[PDB]
Amino acid sequence: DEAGITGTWYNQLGSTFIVTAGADGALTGTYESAVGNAESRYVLTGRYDSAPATDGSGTALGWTVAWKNNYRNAHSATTWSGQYVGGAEARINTQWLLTAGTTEANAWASTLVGHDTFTKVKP
Amino acid sequence: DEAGITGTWYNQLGSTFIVTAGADGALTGTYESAVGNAESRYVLTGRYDSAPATDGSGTALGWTVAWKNNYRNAHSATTWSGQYVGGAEARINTQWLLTAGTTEANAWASTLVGHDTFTKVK
Amino acid sequence: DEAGITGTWYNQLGSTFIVTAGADGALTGTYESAVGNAESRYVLTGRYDSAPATDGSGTALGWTVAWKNNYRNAHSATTWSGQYVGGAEARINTQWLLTAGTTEANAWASTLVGHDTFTKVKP
Amino acid sequence: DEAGITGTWYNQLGSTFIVTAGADGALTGTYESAVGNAESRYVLTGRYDSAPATDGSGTALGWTVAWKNNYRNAHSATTWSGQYVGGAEARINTQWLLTAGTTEANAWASTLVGHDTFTKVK
Ligand SMILES: [Fe+3]
Ligand SMILES: [Fe+3]
């Protein structure tokens, strides 16, 4: 939901995701990672299902961060894919792909995979 | 690589990715999938490294499609995470995650993973 | 970690992983899934690092289940890749890939990804 | 597909996968990687669907390598999950997860994902 997703989210690492959901299905915001080659806030953009099912299924969504801002450039990008689950203990359950720019000889080693769970309460 | 990425791309399935790269690192555009629960064009947004390394490595990028447009809603979203490699054989090499909305009981089964390679012809 | 890995483990879904670690780095056992329409026990085999680092690093391992037994055949296989953490909170943190047999036209839709955490306590 | 799968396979990196498929669903063999922290052959074990569908679907399978042999220990393991596709041009299409032993604080960064296609030729 628009005002379900909009706001501040924390994952299990202590990273902070501040997002605004548009009526169209846009997500826009900033991300601050607690870990990795990262400092301060990075722009994010994504999309969500702006007319989800009302059968107790989650709301599908995804977003991207390119790890370039006015401090640092890690030459990498992370995408989170997952769903917003509402009601009590609201959460966004995600899996993510982090791709680093590599030479083609090393492209086999370009991409990390993991899982982040975001909650409304600070961990 | 604003000029390198901006344009039409095709993956191995015949899906069509039309993207504009902004100087600020933004990606915006439309995606049309050759497969799945998909009809016509869907909005995409993403981000790329607008100041890449100068050493021959690729340009990292990612984008999202939520599979809702004016025709159809599949209650799902896909993210592609990858890199742009330039030249005459320019390609975008990606891996993707497609999450469908599920109940919490079925959340273990929410997410498909695959790989798409996009090129400028075909 | 031969003694550490050997045992009965449960994940967050209530699945049961019974495994014996061999000195050679072998894992052998049975898996019972609580979800995904599996029935009874399936054979598993895998490998672990039989000489891990001593710095507090986890022990890397992986195993495979093909979802065929005497009762049922899902025409699929799951692999788990992860690490065993020792000491007080002994856990195996994994990500997994579940591939189903598909036609070539449908191969894009062959593979689910997820994450399982296994502990010796049943949830 | 016992004899379909049994034998020598090569991926796009020049790695070599030598495998024996048992009647009982077992896979056993050796793996030699062309890349990464790897020298000589490593033991693999896995499983495959020993009674696949007859509808033109591939045969599901998976295997594991822990990257420790007589020569080296990388403190990591890779699992490949995929399917064997027979007929005219035989291939094993896989995705893989490579997990390195890490501390708990660094476990976010433990796992690489990729895709390997193995063919009969080369
Ligand atoms: Fe690395
Ligand atoms: Fe499905």
Q: Residue B107 — φ and ψ, nearest 5°? A: -70, -25
CB contact under 8 A, D63 and C79: yes
Q: Is C18 on the interface with D (CB under 8 A)?
A: no
Ligand closest to Cα of D98 equals 1
H-run or E-run covering C61: strand C59-68
Ligand closest to Cα of A111 equals 1
Chain B residues close to C112, C-beta within 8 Å:
109, 111-113
User: Which residue range(s) make up the domain with D64?
Assistant: 2-119
Q: Read off the CATH number of the domain in which D52 is found.
A: 2.40.128.30
Helix (H, G, I), strand (E, B) or coil at D78: strand
Q: Is B100 on the interface with C (CB under 8 A)?
A: no
Q: How far apart are CA B89 and CA B121, in angstroms?
A: 10
Residue D112 Cα to ligand 1 middle (Å): 8
Residue B94's nearest CA partner among B4, B7, B13 is: B13
Helix (H, G, I), strand (E, B) or coil at B35: coil
Nearest by CB to D45, from C46, C76, C93: name it.
C46
- Residue D16 bridge partners (DSSP): D10, D32
D 29-68: CB under 8 A from C: 43-53, 55-68
CB contact under 8 A, B111 and C112: yes
Q: Tokens in use for A54?
A: 């009302």
- For residues D46-75, b (16+ Cβ closer than 10 Å) or e, as one string? bbbbbebbeeebbbbbbbbbbbbbeeebbb
Angle at A92 (CA atoms; ends A86, A94), nearest 5 degrees? 145
Q: How far apart are CA B44 and CA B15, in angstroms?
A: 13
Determine how many CB atoms are found less than 10 A away from the CB of residue C76.
25
- For residues A42-74, b (16+ Cβ closer than 10 Å) or e, as one string? bbbbbbbbbebeeeebbbbbbbbbbbbbeeebb
Determine how many CB atoms are found less than 10 A away from the CB of residue B120.
14
| Resolution value, angstrom units | 1.7
Which residues are CB-neighbours of D106 under 8 A, at least 6 positions away?
none
Q: How far apart are CA C20 and CA C41, in angstroms?
A: 15
Q: Tokens in use for A49?
A: 């299902």
Q: How many domains does chain D have?
A: 1
Residue D112's nearest CA partner among D32, D41, D35 is: D35
Nearest by CB to A56, from B44, B53, B103: name it.
B103
Which residues are CB-neighbours of A87 under 8 A, at least 6 positions away?
none
